A paper describes a structure:
Mitochondrial fission is a critical cellular event to maintain organelle function. This multistep process is initiated by the enhanced recruitment and oligomerization of dynamin-related protein 1 (Drp1) at the surface of mitochondria. As a member of the dynamin superfamily of proteins (DSPs), controlled Drp1 self-assembly into large helical polymers stimulates its GTPase activity to promote membrane constriction. All DSPs have two common domains, a GTPase or G domain, where GTP binding and hydrolysis occurs, and the stalk, comprised of the middle domain and GTPase effector domain (GED), which together drive self-assembly. Dynamin-related protein 1 (Drp1), the master regulator of mitochondrial fission, has a unique intervening sequence adjacent to the stalk called the variable domain (VD), composed of 136 intrinsically disordered residues that confer lipid sensing.
Author numbering:
A (entry chain A), B (entry chain B): 1 to 498, 640 to 736
The structure:
């Protein structure tokens, strides 16, 4: 069936209403470049002009366009949702509350107003997306995500290094293996020089998810026809290439007729391209995009279902936590503190059901630092320190003095090995902070995934984070001093009593004693850190939380709920209902589609 | 060889000064009983009256009678050893110089006066022997040890424990395996009743080294007969029994000619002893004693030669130490401090040439403590002993919570292994104390063998010993704290990162971790102890010595000297000369006796 796309659209609008996350469900992301009239193509598909276009960047903020296939039957069921104004091809904004704008001039004016208000004179990066639900009968069910396009020469007033930021934003958006890359390039510049195809190949060298679009098919008269480009024989695309005659900004701003432009484009394609005319059309292009999106949804159905189940479980836990009455504050807060301490201890030991060997965090990261980081850093130093025998001879001569060399002075050895042992001090401290910082990464990590009950009340989460940070800061100097004392004992007092022959003996003693000291440090420092820092704090975390979260009335402050938090709770309950409905709908589909 | 006899006597006048007999040597020790006529027999043997008369107790201090036959050959062994003596017949004391006693009565009076002065009014026994050498043409070369006689009158100013003191003094001499016990036995009663026989059976029931001389024969003329005791039918001996008549004190005090007494004794022996008349006598007793001594010297030739050479070398080294006293206070003190520091460092290295006669070469012993003693002590403390079913059950139930336990919680295992490891603190302190005692023994070795010149100045010796001991004792607590910290660190770390069933699992894990911790502590703690104690002392010995000993107002007090030290040095020089002479005399024998 084709209800999967409407279900995804419902999920997306719910996510936007509840602060949509970066992890988005399968959607078509459009990437353009210089002289790319993406907005013109979207208007041609819609059949009316409703967005501002421009060479390269059309809107300097992310734009979410939901083309809803609202047939004549559903016109009265969708126009009546808000206000009383109704039409056949109409757009709704959720960033701007209600106020349906049937007239496209109002939509353009609102877009310009918001762009000026937010982006300002210099157009930077705005992670907040812009949502616009378009309803029309001609348009098929589709979800388009428009972002600034990669351009060698930035258009308008923007940072000269904005190209890297745009590329990183596109990579972040298409990181999930569910986005359909709609590549739009100007016929004036070869696709090889275009950056959109470069990024598409970087994320996917094969054209398994990239649809190349050739625009500006009006200037080919002054040059060469794009027939070869559409065929795509230099860099074949496994999905195909569709080209249309893009409309200039001047004509669009003059309130032109979209039907005339579509007719001219169709005639041009039919004449210049005897074969690339059946599928190179607005309706055909929209249907091809919808089919590609459906294919991607079919491919990602297992991962999509896994993500949906994870989100449903998270929201169920959030609802269960939020519904607990504040009655009996002491017992509930004590239970929450005990649960948080148990989760933290399990994460330290790795027994918590949120971290595995695949993911580096908590105990796993500490073990990696102790074994690989610290061990490899210590091993990086050569046993002799890389000093040539000439240096050893010079040191021996300097220490012994101007007398014949017949007895080996051990002090010379002490002068050299120490220098190497001192170099072992720096990595240890570097590791200690890496461990300390790692503890900090735990504090939020659980709250990010495990202890959402902390996120329920921001005050409680902040207080717990501050208490844990203070405990870590108090324990850091003690562990650091103990490690430094161990290093000092192993460094200052080494001794051997605990010309060529003298140099050889000194070098051998240096190597042997340095290896022994390195082994001792490797065996001791991690164990000392576990003693003073990890093991000591494991059980003490619960006691510290209990003693710091309750003096006489601190419980009320911790469990404070904000109005924004209440709104988020309501939106999350709505999201939970939507997730339950989506899971019920998906359960109808057989497992044949989950492969 | 005659020269072999006097030299041994010189040894008896040197080692006995420092205490007991350092080396067993062929010698004659006279042991008497109550109412013993030893004085008369000795006077008859000497040919003149030179000892106190009377029976029972006649001398209160160890008196040595060293008769030397006059001969030009022996002169080299007499004048060279002493400051110089030459006369016809005379007695000389090694404790006195520049005075020759040509009259034996004067010798006896001087001996009595010295004994009274040293021992005071008391008749007890003092720890100070007497040296006496008698030269005459009618005395065979023989050395005897005339110990204080037995007294049966404990009452009076003399100590009530005189018998015990006399027994201990006699034992100190006869305990040597090379000594020959001349037992003076009273013929009035059975030989066993005599104290000499009683003491003889304590360690030498065979009597292989016991030569019996029967006294108190004057009163045996009427009544009981002494023939039974003379024949040895009471306590037979393997060497023979000699009968000498006890001369009356009154007759001797009246200036009785010794020749007349000898004639009377010979007549009495002929009349009363037909079996043994010319075969028994004081001269025959002296000849038998000399024969036994010479035969024992012949038997001990190899070992005696080796020991004499070793002692000669050692005393030459001591004289070299005693050779040149301090000439410049500051320079001599600095040289002594530097030499002491070097010797201490060498001893710590376990390679110093100077070594004791009872232990290892100082620092080497310390290594042994770290190898076998400490390891065996640690292994003696088995992991089992502190675990029982009741305590294990209680710990498991407490760790699990308010519900029964059917698993193996890690907290209980960690607590139990920590408690077991805490038991390892005591062996560490034992090893540290052993190392400290070894260092004290090294200090004593340096004081007594390597720094005899330091001994000459007792103040400096005491100051150095006290300073070193105080430094070691002050470094001791720091090492103890470091080892305790190491033990505490080694027990908290968890190495697993890289009801009967539960109890058995807990016990096995505890045993494994305890063994691992024992290995780790045995590998580590010795290094820390050497760093804090061995290396630190090696580095700071000179600094501490300079800081504590070097002063501008202690040179005179530290370097005090006394004439007694000069006398002891002269005695040591005489000892060295006598040892060299004995070595030269003994080096004239063939080599077949060595194998």
């Amino acid at each position: 069936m084709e209800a999967l796309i409407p279900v995804i659209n419902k999920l997306q609008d719910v996510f936007n209403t509840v602060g949509a996350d970066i992890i988005q469900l399968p959607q078509i992301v459009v990437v353009g470049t210089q002289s790319s009239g993406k907005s013109s193509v979207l208007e041609s598909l819609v059949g009316r002009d409703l967005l501002p276009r421009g060479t390269g960047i059309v809107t300097r903020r992310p734009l979410i366009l939901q083309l809803v296939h609202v047939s004549q039957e559903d016109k009265r069921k969708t126009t009546g949702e808000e206000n009383g104004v109704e039409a056949e091809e109409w757009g709704k904004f959720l960033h701007t509350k209600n106020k349906l704008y049937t007239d496209f001039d109002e939509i353009r004016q609102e877009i310009e107003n918001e762009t000026e208000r937010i982006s300002g004179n210099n157009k930077g990066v705005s992670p907040e997306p812009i949502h616009l639900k378009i309803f029309s009968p001609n348009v098929v069910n589709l979800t388009l995500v428009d972002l600034p396009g990669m351009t060698k020469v930035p258009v308008g007033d923007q940072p000269k290094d904005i190209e890297l930021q745009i590329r990183e934003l596109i990579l972040r958006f298409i990181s999930n293996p569910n986005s359909i890359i709609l590549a739009v390039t100007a016929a004036n510049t070869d696709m090889a020089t275009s950056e959109a195809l470069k990024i598409s190949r970087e994320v996917d060298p094969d054209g398994r998810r990239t649809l190349a679009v050739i625009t500006k098919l009006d200037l080919m008269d002054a040059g060469t026809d794009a027939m070869d480009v559409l065929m795509g024989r230099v860099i074949p695309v496994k999905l195909g290439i569709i080209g249309v005659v893009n409309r200039s900004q001047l004509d669009i701003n003059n309130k032109k007729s979209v039907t005339d432009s579509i007719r001219d484009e169709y005639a041009f394609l039919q004449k210049k391209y005897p074969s690339l005319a059946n599928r190179n059309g607005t309706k055909y292009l929209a249907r091809t995009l919808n089919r590609l999106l459906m294919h991607h949804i079919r491919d990602c159905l297992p991962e999509l279902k896994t993500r949906i189940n994870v989100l449903a479980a998270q929201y169920q836990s959030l609802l269960n936590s939020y519904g607990e009455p504040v009655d009996d504050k002491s017992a509930t807060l004590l239970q929450l503190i005990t649960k948080f301490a148990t989760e933290y201890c399990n994460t330290i030991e790795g027994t918590a059901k949120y971290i595995e060997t695949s993911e580096l965090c908590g105990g796993a990261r500490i073990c990696y630092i102790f074994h690989e980081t610290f061990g490899r850093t210590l091993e990086s130093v050569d046993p002799l320190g890389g000093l040539n025998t000439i240096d050893i001879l010079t040191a021996i001569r300097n220490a012994t003095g101007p007398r014949p060399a017949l007895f080996v002075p051990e002090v010379s050895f002490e002068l050299l090995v120490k220098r190497q042992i001192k170099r072992l001090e720096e990595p240890s401290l570097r590791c200690v902070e890496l461990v300390h910082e790692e503890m900090q990464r735990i504090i939020q990590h659980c709250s990010n995934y495990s202890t959402q009950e902390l996120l329920r009340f921001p005050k409680l989460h902040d207080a717990i984070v501050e208490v844990v940070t203070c405990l870590l800061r108090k324990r850091l100097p003690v562990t650091n001093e103990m490690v430094h004392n161990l290093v000092a004992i192993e460094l200052a007092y080494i001794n051997t009593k605990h010309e060529q022959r003298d140099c050889e003996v000194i070098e051998r003693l240096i190597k042997s004693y340095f290896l022994i000291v390195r082994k001792n440090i490797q065996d001791s420092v991690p164990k000392a850190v576990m003693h003073f820092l990890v093991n000591h704090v494991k059980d003490t975390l619960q006691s510290e939380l209990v003693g710091q979260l309750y003096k006489s009335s601190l419980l009320d402050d911790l469990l404070t709920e904000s109005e924004d938090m209440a709104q988020r709770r309501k939106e999350a309950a709505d999201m939970l209902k939507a997730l339950q409905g989506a899971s019920q709908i998906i359960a109808e589909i057989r497992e044949t589609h989950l492969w």
